[PDB]
Amino acid sequence: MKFTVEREHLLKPLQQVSGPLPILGNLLLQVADGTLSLTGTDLEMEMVARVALVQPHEPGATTVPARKFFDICRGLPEGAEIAVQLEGERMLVRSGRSRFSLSTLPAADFPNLDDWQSEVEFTLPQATMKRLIEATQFSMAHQDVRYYLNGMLFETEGEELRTVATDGHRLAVCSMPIGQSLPSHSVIVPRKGVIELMRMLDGGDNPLRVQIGSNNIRAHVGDFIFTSKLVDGRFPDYRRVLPKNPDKHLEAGCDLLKQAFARAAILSNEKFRGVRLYVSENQLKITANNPEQEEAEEILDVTYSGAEMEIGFNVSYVLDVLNALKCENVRMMLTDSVSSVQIEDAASQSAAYVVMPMR
């Protein structure tokens, strides 16, 4: 295996394949068909990047330490050409009068996701996928014993792709049109897979091809291909989580609401930050207190219809939703003091959030 390539053409590939990250700490390099392919994996998912080779090259494959190789390439000057030469247990890297010998492990030892079969496929702009994940990812569970919640549901229905995330306490759901009729289908992508996928997608106008199998998902954009195993469990139905008949409706400025929550939380319990909402005619009062008997109170002029009520919320859950919305006005749909609330952008129905009350 031998190739020469511009540093500039390796930089983004190396960045992408380095997260998922003993051979799991290595990158797989393969020269074939005038292409350098770089692969990183953690056994559950894999990222592949391809780079065209113009300069003379020789086919072959090896694995090298990812961080060492990345740091070498990044550390070379802008404009550097990088020559690579496999020599048994070492891979030689040369650029100008900078020379490196890295230890190798065999390509044959590198874990390979087993072959699988695609069952549903579609293309959508990477920007749409990014929107769907950003709208919902914060509501995924982290290391719950309900293993099926440590990830995100991807659902196709009609002409929409929908994402759902929940940790049992709050839920986020977002649906986007993709311009083609799809079979009805749902799979759970593991949370680390979601985060890696999210990081693969930049700001560009770029078609993203998605292929979903029984046990795997794959996304292809430009010269990158991401593949993850799926989570094999039964995900809750968001339709049954949405409040069925809220009779109380609050509307307020997103940022005013956000800043009022954030201030009141200062004097909530540091270990478990919650605030009390008192809603009445045209007014919202948010209060907090802590074991030192310190107290905060915020009064806001708001749009409100319904009976007077008091209800508590975990601050981080509400702030997470308001931060995700990034909009002018927010709507809160309430039922009673012991039932979850729905929160949406007043000007958009593409996402919705359900939050259980606290206390």
Ligand X SMILES: O=C1Nc2ccc(Cl)cc2C1=O
| Span from 45-53, 54-62, 89-97, 228-236 in contact with Cl ion (CB under 5 A) | 45-53
Q: Does the protein bind ligand X through residue 176 (CB under 6 A)? A: no
User: What Rg value do the Cα atoms of the chain yield, rounded?
Assistant: 25
For residue 158 the two structure tokens come to 């009609």
- Cα 18 from Cα 168, distance rounded (Å): 32
d(CA 320, CA 305): 25
346 binds, among Cl ion, a copy of itself, ligand X, none (CB under 5 to 8 A by kind): none
For residue 147, the minimal CB distance to ligand X (Å) is: 13
Q: Is 233 in the site for ligand X (CB under 6 A)?
A: no
Residue with tokens 């998605």: 210
Given the rule CB under 8 A, which residues bind a copy of itself? 68, 71-72, 75-77, 90, 97-103, 259-260, 262-263, 266-267, 292-300
Asked whether residue 147 is marked as a ligand-binding residue, the answer is yes
Q: Are 190 and 233 in contact (CB under 8 A)?
A: no
CB nearer ligand X, residue 166 or residue 268: 166
**41 touches, from ligand X, Ca ion, a copy of itself, none (C-beta below 5 to 8 Å by class):** none
Helices marked H in 5-153 = 7-18, 66-75, 126-136
Q: What is the dihedral of CA 31, 35, 36, 41, to 10 degrees?
A: -100
Q: According to the annotation, is 199 in a ligand binding site?
A: no
CB 230, CB 291: distance < 8 Å: no
Q: Residue 166: name its binding partner from ligand X, Cl ion, Ca ion, none (Cβ under 5 to 8 Å by kind).
A: ligand X
21 or 262: CB nearest a copy of itself: 262
Is 309 a binding residue for ligand X by CB under 6 A? The answer is no
Site string for ligand X, 320-349 (x = CB under 6 A): --------------------x---------
- Which DSSP helix (H) or strand (E) runs through 196? helix 191-200
Amino acid occupying residue 30: Q
CA-based nearest residue to 223, from 1, 82, 5, 16: 16
User: Which residues contact Ca ion (rule: CB under 5 A)?
Assistant: 79, 89, 103, 105, 207, 209, 220
How many residues of this chain interact with ligand X, rule: CB under 6 A? 10
Distance CA 203, CA 161 (A): 20
Structural contact between residues 277 and 264, judged by C-beta atoms closer than 8 angstroms: no
We find the least distance from the C-beta atom of residue 193 to ligand X, in angstroms, to be 20
Q: Is there binding between residue 241 and ligand X (CB under 6 A)?
A: yes
- Interface with Cl ion, residue 52, by CB under 5 A: yes
* 67 known member of a binding site: yes
CA–CA separation, 22 vs 149, rounded Å? 29
Least distance to Cl ion from the beta carbon of 255, Å? Answer: 29
Give yes or no for residue 236 binding ligand X (CB under 6 A). yes
When binding is defined by CB under 6 A, the residue of 7, 57, 162, 170 that contacts ligand X is 170
Q: CA 251, CA 301: separation in Å to the nearest integer?
A: 10
Smallest distance, a copy of itself to C-beta of residue 90, A: 8
In the chain, what is the straight-line distance between the N-terminal and C-terminal CA atoms, in Å? Answer: 64
How are beta strands 45-52 and 35-41 bridged, if at all? Answer: antiparallel
Q: Is 143 annotated as a binding residue?
A: yes
Task: Identify the CA nearest to 163 among candidates 238, 221, 232.
Answer: 238
Give the Å distances, CA to CA, from 290 to 171, 266, 274, 295, 348.
Answer: 27, 9, 10, 7, 36
Examine residue 222 and tell whether it contacts ligand X (CB under 6 A): no
**Partner whose binding site includes residue 52, from ligand X, a copy of itself, Cl ion, none (CB under 5 to 8 Å by kind):** Cl ion
- Of residues 186 and 290, the one with the C-beta less far from a copy of itself: 290
Per CB under 5 A, does 54 bind Cl ion?
no
Binding residues for DNA: 67, 143, 147-148
Binding residues: 67, 143, 147-148
Interacting residues toward ligand X by CB under 6 A:
166, 168-171, 236, 241, 340, 354, 356
